[PDB]
Amino acid sequence: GVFCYEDEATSVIPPARLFKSFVLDADNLIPKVAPQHFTGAENLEGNGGPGTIKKITFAEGSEFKYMKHKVEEIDHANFKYCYSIIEGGPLGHTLEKISYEIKMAAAPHGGGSILKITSKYHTKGNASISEEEIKAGKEKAAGLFKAVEAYLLAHPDTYC
C-alpha cells in the first residue's frame, strides 16, 4: 500500500495564507523556487477546489515530466490539504501514486504558523519501491520544500 514520510517547518505568517499556497499552487510551488523540476501543472478539469485534476508537465529548458495530478481533499477547518500524482512516465510502472498531505497550524506561542508536509508513496504490489529509494524520492522534494521556505525567509512579506 503506502510508505509515509514527514517534515515539519514554520512560517512567520499566520496559517491560512500559507494554506492557499499549497491548495492553489502545491504542484507549481517547487517550480516557484526551481522550475528545473517541472514547468508546474495546468488544470484539466474541475473549478479549482476539491477534486480538481491537473497535468504536471515539462521542465525549465526540457520536456521531461508528464504526470496526471488530482486534488484529493481540502480539510479547511483543520487546514489540511491532500493532492496526488496519479503516476506517469518514469515512476509509473513500479508506483501507483505519489500522494502528499500538507498541514498548517498556528505556532503554539509563535503567532505565525507550523507547516507539516507528509509524502506517501503508493506502490504496485508486485513491483514495490525499495525503502532507500523512497527516502531518496522524499528527500528530493524535501530539499525543494526547504528551498521555497528559504526564499520566504528572504522575503517574509510573500506567502511563497
Q: Is 60 helix (H, G, I), strand (E, B) or coil?
A: coil
Cβ distance 159 to 152 under 8 Å?
A: yes
What was the elucidation method?
NMR
* CA distances, 75 to each of 51, 82, 100, 112 (Å): 12, 8, 14, 20
Q: Which residues contact 91 (CB under 8 A, 6 or more apart)?
A: 67, 85, 98
Instruction: Please give the tally of structural domains in the chain.
Output: 1
Q: Could you tell me how far CA 78 lies from the centroid of its own chain?
A: 18
- Cα–Cα dist 19/15, whole Å: 6
Closest listed residue to residue 83, CA positions, set 25, 148, 143, 134: 25
Beta bridge partners of 121: 3, 98
* CA distances, 96 to each of 1, 37, 90, 120, 149 (Å): 9, 20, 12, 11, 29
Pseudo-torsion of CA 13, 98, 38, 22, nearest 10°? -20
How many helices (H) and strands (E) in the chain? 3, 7
> Which residues constitute the domain of residue 90?
1-160
Residue corresponding to grid cell 481533499: 73
